[PDB]
Ligand binder design. Sequence first.
Ligand SMILES: C1=C2C=c3cc(-c4cn(C5CCNCC5)nc4-c4ccncc4)ccc3=C2N=N1
Length: 262
Amino acid sequence: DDWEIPDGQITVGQRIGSGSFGTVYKGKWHGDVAVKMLNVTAPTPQQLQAFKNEVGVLRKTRHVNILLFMGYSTKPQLAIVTQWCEGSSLYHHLHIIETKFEMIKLIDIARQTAQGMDYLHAKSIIHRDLKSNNIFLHEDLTVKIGDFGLATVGSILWMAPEVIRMQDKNPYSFQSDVYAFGIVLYELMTGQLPYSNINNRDQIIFMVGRGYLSPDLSKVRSNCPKAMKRLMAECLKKKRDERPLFPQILASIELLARSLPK
Ligand SMILES: C1=C2C=c3cc(-c4cn(C5CCNCC5)nc4-c4ccncc4)ccc3=C2N=N1
């Protein structure tokens, strides 16, 4: 029953990058797997908590749109094993290799992302770090939401105005994830990161915080549906209580998707 994998069964290969509280590798364990490892000599009580926190969250998830947790390892280093997804993240497709997706496919990505987030919020799981980079495209058609190191039951462009000015203790909520989803909606419909004409990071942080800066919604492409643009503005509201929850958001995307191919 237990998910602890006996040591050395995981064959660590190519270093593919870094996630939250670890370095990610392409491993081999009963096929191709993604393994997030600590590569640190001795784990801190800080790093030990962050490990058991993520594993505890991941073992509560069983969904087609959530990155499938396969197991964990403690004996060599603190490692977490998930499924391998050929084809890079949504951030990579849109901003690195500049892949040109069709509107039908762009909305399908947004629908699956909302579908996975609805599954998390139903199980009272707040991602707290939802971004294009944590949204993974498996086989170029299936969306997988990954990296749950900051989940509770770094990147500023997806952070809500409430989150960016730390008051009070917990600015993270279901609606804070909605804003982060609002930004990935923007990215899909524009093909660009928000505030791209501004180079100063500290000026963006301050300007979103005080409520002077909001994403340029008129940047969306001409073939983007009016129902998509309207939903985008609802998710990107400065006040969190004026934002819809994912049960409502999912139903909105599913509605505009059916009256789209015609
Ligand atoms: C276990 C994990 C394996 C894992 C892999 C990752 C991850 C990070 N990247 C890179 C990073 C740089 N940009 C391009 C994509 N790709 C993946 C990945 C690879 C295969 N399947 C799923 C995800 C992210 C988070 C986790 C994670 N969190 N817990």
